[PDB]
DNA sequence: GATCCATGCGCGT
DNA sequence: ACGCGCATGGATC
């Protein structure tokens, strides 16, 4: 594995971790990677898909349309790539597209092993 | 030092397996890189040999063709790259174009290693 | 240290 | 726009 399919994997732990944590939002900002609580590894891969298509805009940043709507990716309003149903926009090629897709392989392997 | 040379070997190896796995889909899709099934090796060094002759269009996807037709390159389709006959049809050169010349030469003087 | 490889920037059609 | 050429860089042993 390369180091920018390493970081994906991080981020999209250290914050699924985040999301499906129910307690009180102070100790909801410890939350690291190497902290042990409770993620989805189904939405895991579910964020690396659609961080395998991102597409930037002309201003040189992404832009995704859910059925909400079209949404920047930043900080606050990520967690809604955890989801299959989630649509890119765009020109050329992002940031991380087509470089994760050897990533995926190898993690549905690993899950969807007996 | 080889991540493009290495995932692409695992790849084909893995997918060719299951393209000459004639048993029941259950345990089809249960087989890996490790797993002893047979796969055919002049058919491994022509995917890698073809997927050093990739041609991603505008979109960024390795469009191909073959007798029956132009197909994009995903998970369903990567077992028509074993065959020898396949044109590229892309506007700009692929993720692994030119990548892996040295990859097949050191494959193929090892294969006909008396 | 060298080999190998990849990413990038510049100049050409 | 894409292709080729060159340069920088870093991954290892």
Redesign the interface.
């Known amino acids: ?2 180091h920018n399919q390493r970081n994906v994997f991080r981020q999209a732990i250290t914050l699924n971790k985040k999301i499906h944590f129910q307690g009180d939002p102070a100790t909801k900002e410890i939350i690291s990677f190497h902290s042990p609580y409770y993620f989805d590894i189904n939405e895991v891969i579910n964020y690396i898909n659609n961080r395998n298509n991102e597409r930037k805009n002309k201003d040189n940043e992404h832009i995704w349309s859910d059925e909400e709507g079209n949404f920047k990716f930043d900080n606050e309003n990520a967690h809604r790539l955890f989801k299959e149903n989630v649509t890119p926009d765009g020109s ?2 992002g940031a991380l ?2 470089k994760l897709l ?1 990533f995926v ?1 190898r993690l549905q ?1 690993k899950i ?3």
Chains 1, 2 share one sequence.
Do not use: H
């Open positions: 594995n390369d050329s090629a597209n087509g050897n392989d392997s969807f092993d007996k």
